[PDB]
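Components:
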Amino acid sequence: GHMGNAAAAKKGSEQESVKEFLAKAKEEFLKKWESPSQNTAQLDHFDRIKTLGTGSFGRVMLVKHKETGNHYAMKILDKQKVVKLKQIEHTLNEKRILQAVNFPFLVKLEFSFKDNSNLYMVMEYVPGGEMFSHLRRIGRFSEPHARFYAAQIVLTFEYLHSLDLIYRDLKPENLLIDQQGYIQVTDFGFAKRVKGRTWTLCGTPEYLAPEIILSKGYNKAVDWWALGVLIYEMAAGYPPFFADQPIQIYEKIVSGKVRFPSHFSSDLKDLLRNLLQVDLTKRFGNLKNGVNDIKNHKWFATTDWIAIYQRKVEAPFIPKFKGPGDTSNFDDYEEEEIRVSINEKCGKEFTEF
Amino acid sequence: TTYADFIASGRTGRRNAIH
Ligand SMILES: N#Cc1cc(-c2cccc(C3(CN)CCOCC3)c2)ccc1N
Ligand SMILES: [Cl-]
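Structure:
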């Protein structure tokens, strides 16, 4: 066989220990899911410094807590825009997930509050910026560098899936790098509690699994497909399926064909063919052996999963850091004032926030 | 090359989610 006695016993024990960890983690998540925290700070507790990113209904800013001097990232959502864009449920769900999860690669919610006009989530500040920027600048990551990040996503999805959470929003634009070079996942608007299947068309064209494109009921296997897209893009510098227009991307995704750069190792190509598998009865992460087909793949043979979780592996890349509050690794955005209206807006719909 | 095709796609910047 592939393993002698000692290696087989060690692997078996490790896999049983994962089950034991996840059972405890689920119990802890379910307690917090049922008894969420709320109303833990206020706006005049913070100085607003700079915008780190924007979207159609909200922005994220670097802020400084006045009394302590500690920096945080504050997501500000305009209640009226959330309603207009049909994002009430996603917004409440994102906050509920963030309050209840606990894992070293998931961003921590430190405070949350609301006022007459806005909702506020105050999270850890992650000073290395988006993976996207580093990837486009460097061009591509070497296989060991890509593998270090991939391993963190594997563990994060193993954790989320054990809680019956599908993630659905994986891409380099949505992954931040911390001061130690490790990944932080921040965005949970598209995540959903799904023990079985779900049906919403959501995601980003390059990262959509075929079964989403084809309007099927789908399951957590879409996250394993997206992991394949991410690993490919990290290692190649471009994603496996691209074109001028989304429809042409979708035709490539559903085709069952993927091509690889000549510098990809055979181990990497094998892993990617098994993750980027159109046939759900064959996709790694969706078989009888679950996540173990991924974790035990040859491409991950050098990965010490516990050392990654414990953050004891030296990162391949440490972002520049001039000190607390340094925003050099984020883009510059037009700044806009935070207007708080004299009249409360949308109180009933956000009672749970 | 494949890289040139990627540049030609116009989708090298941050990508939005659908709808
Ligand atoms: N530090 C930090 C930090 C940064 C962000 C952030 C930064 C840039 C853009 C974005 C979005 C795209 N992922 C675009 C804007 O709406 C949110 C999602 C998010 C979120 C949470 C954090 N804790
Ligand atoms: Cl961009």
